[PDB]
């Protein structure tokens, strides 16, 4: 009974992560921050077609997936930092072609690989580097001319929700894999829950809402 019930969850990891992969590959959605979000899409789709099914070379991929997620979660907090502390535009200095090479390197290193090497370290820095970001993003957020927006006639409040949607996607992966790295099968089941949150929070938070609704023929809010 409960087994067949968990079969619907699988489709969520083969559909919720597909509508994302094909989304990035619209012109407006093609960005570096979204180029690592699609990296986590593959790490989630592979764990949904290779790990979830058989679990409900097989363990080799189970590691490659998870040890690449929390690894890229670190890549994000460091990339977005080089964009806020940046002088020019709210935009990382990582080029499109240099984003692909650091994406390919995330997999190889994640493959040659431990809860301190592939969990602690990448989460330790990922939390502090991002903590530095959310703090600076507040100092700058309201260093803005107060007159701006009420007497009209660059980092702003809109770009401040881009770190909210990224702050929760990074804040959920931790509470879903922390008790696990800290019944043992149930907490290893809580880990698989982060597979249905990515396409969920990417609705009522970012632009993806409009992306997802397009990929599905003018769903409802048209």
């Amino acid at each position, epitope marked *: 009974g409960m087994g067949i019930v968990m079969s619907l969850i699988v489709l969520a990891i083969v559909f919720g992560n597909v509508l994302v992969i094909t989304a990035i590959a619209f012109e407006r959605l093609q960005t570096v921050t979204n180029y690592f979000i699609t990296s986590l899409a593959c790490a989630d789709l592979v764990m949904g077609l290779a790990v979830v099914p058989f679990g409900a070379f097989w363990t080799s991929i189970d590691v490659l997936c998870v040890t690449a997620s929390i690894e890229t979660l670190c890549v994000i907090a460091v990339d977005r930092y080089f964009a806020i502390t940046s002088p020019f535009k709210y935009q990382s200095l990582l080029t499109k072609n240099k984003a692909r090479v650091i994406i390919l390197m995330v997999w190889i290193v994640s493959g040659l690989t431990s809860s301190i090497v592939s969990f602690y370290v990448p989460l330790v820095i990922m939390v502090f580097v991002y903590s530095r970001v959310f703090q600076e993003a507040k100092r700058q957020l309201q260093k803005i001319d*107060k*007159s701006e*927006g*009420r*007497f*009209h006639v660059k980092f702003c*409040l809109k770009e*401040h929700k881009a770190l909210k949607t990224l702050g929760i996607i990074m804040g959920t992966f931790t509470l879903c894999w922390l008790p696990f790295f800290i019944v043992y099968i149930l907490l290893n089941w809580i880990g698989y829950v982060n597979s249905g949150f990515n396409p969920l929070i990417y609705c009522r938070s970012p632009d993806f809402r409009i992306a997802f609704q397009e990929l599905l023929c003018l769903r409802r809010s048209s």
Partner: antibody
Amino acid sequence: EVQLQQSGAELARPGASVKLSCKASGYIFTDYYINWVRQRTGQGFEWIGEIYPGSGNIDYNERFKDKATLTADKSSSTAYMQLSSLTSEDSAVYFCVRGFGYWGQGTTLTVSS
Amino acid sequence: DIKMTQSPSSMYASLGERVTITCKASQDINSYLSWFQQKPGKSPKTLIYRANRLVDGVPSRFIGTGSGQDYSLTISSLDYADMGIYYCLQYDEFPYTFGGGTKLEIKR
């Protein structure tokens, strides 16, 4: 042709609730905060809250904290104010400003049996 | 919160003469002050924001000049149409606090 339209008159019994709307049209809705200000009969103004349509950041006045709840509609380009458990002292003119720059028409709410 | 007095309270001036109204806040707003005008039976029209920056469409005879804690709206050469209640407003920090509002009439 910049303007924020409002009801002008709203009647509601005590203990009830009203939802005042403000239909802006003459600029880009998601470029300006919209503020809701209360001005009682022949008295000054008191800021209720300030919702920013673009993002969603809503900042209330402690006084109206659990009283009013602002809400915007990026599509309809209209913003509402949810006012709950109304009381006799809630009767006044409720303004919808485009951030203290362009004041709305004004809705004359009156709580009465 | 942040009290903001606004002297005078009442004021009778005659056409042509310059009326001046002052507005002081308790805290130190960063010139984030605004001046607006309520006329009996109308909606408040804004004259000035950011301490000195006239709003577009407002007569150049309105002059806001203040800094830090004390500001003041001046109108050189008072016009007949310039009769009503003028309020000041600070938007430096929450909650936004309005002034009492000085009322200006014209001696006939």
